[PDB]
Amino acid sequence: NLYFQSMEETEKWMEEAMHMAKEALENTEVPVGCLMVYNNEVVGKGRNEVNQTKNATRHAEMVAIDQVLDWCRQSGKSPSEVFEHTVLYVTVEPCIMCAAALRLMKIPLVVYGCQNERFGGCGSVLNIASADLPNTGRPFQCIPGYRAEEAVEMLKTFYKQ
Amino acid sequence: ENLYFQSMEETEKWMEEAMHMAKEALENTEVPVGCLMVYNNEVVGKGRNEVNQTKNATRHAEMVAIDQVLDWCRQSGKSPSEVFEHTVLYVTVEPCIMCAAALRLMKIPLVVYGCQNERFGGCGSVLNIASADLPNTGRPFQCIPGYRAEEAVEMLKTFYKQ
Ligand SMILES: [Zn+2]
Ligand SMILES: [Zn+2]
């Protein structure tokens, strides 16, 4: 019997992701913060660590997935069991790489802020999220736009440097 | 600063090794994809699919290899951008949309691959991320498909009967 996050709890999670975006901005990373909630527990967090780590794959979303995998390791739960019922709260539309990754992990729902004009994979440049692809992952659902103005303002100021 | 370029025979050599790795993947109940990454005439990363062993849907052969190259960098003192930007990837199956997006972001300049990826190919089959006009996200890269495609598709086909 799993627990479903209400609207106010969502706004609350997206608030915490924004604070993480602010932290990333200040560490000279792309301002992207994200959270993964399962059964009313925060099961993965992540900021962009591309500059720190010097590894271009390490977007907020990827850092999160590892934390959740670590979570499963320690709870004894299986990843399929967990990811299939997990909600992602991210500051920016997941890019094509992350969107293709989230399909493969089968996260059903993603709540994001602003559009990813450069490389966004939920409609901006491609819609991998809804792609009719039979034998690869599952499609997922998006609720875009939550505090987009702020998110995009961070993104913009970051792209000057 | 004088970097070494792998020849045709040397490419054929690395693809044979990627083929053996794909065999090992098959026999471990993994999607049969093996790959190598070569920098300045050195094997700087290897990888097979580990999705089942690891139970993480993103650990495609290419992602295993990238982690290994990053590990090689740590120990060689060389920077990731200086290495990946001159690394050739040798793979059994066309990189998927996820991996192709990654390879753009890592800025690997050349992928040599085997058979097509009909379900999730990102070099032309389903989408062509490799050659996409995307100004401020990674670099586009080049592909040499088809090296021993027949055997590569034969392995994949045999694998999809489970
Ligand atoms: Zn991303
Ligand atoms: Zn792949």
UniProtKB/Swiss-Prot annotation, chain B:
Residues 9-134 form the CMP/dCMP-type deaminase domain. Zn(2+) binds at residues 60, 96, 99. One of its GO terms (biological process) is tRNA wobble adenosine to inosine editing. One of its GO terms (cellular component) is nucleoplasm. The active site is at residue 62. The keyword Metal-binding applies. Keywords: Hydrolase, Metal-binding, tRNA processing, Zinc. One of its GO terms (molecular function) is tRNA-specific adenosine-34 deaminase activity. The keyword tRNA processing applies. Its EC number is 3.5.4.33. Its cofactor is Zn(2+). It catalyses: adenosine(34) in tRNA + H2O + H(+) = inosine(34) in tRNA + NH4(+). It comes from the Eukaryota. Probably participates in deamination of adenosine-34 to inosine in many tRNAs. Belongs to the cytidine and deoxycytidylate deaminase family. ADAT2 subfamily. This is tRNA-specific adenosine deaminase 2. It comes from Homo sapiens (Human).
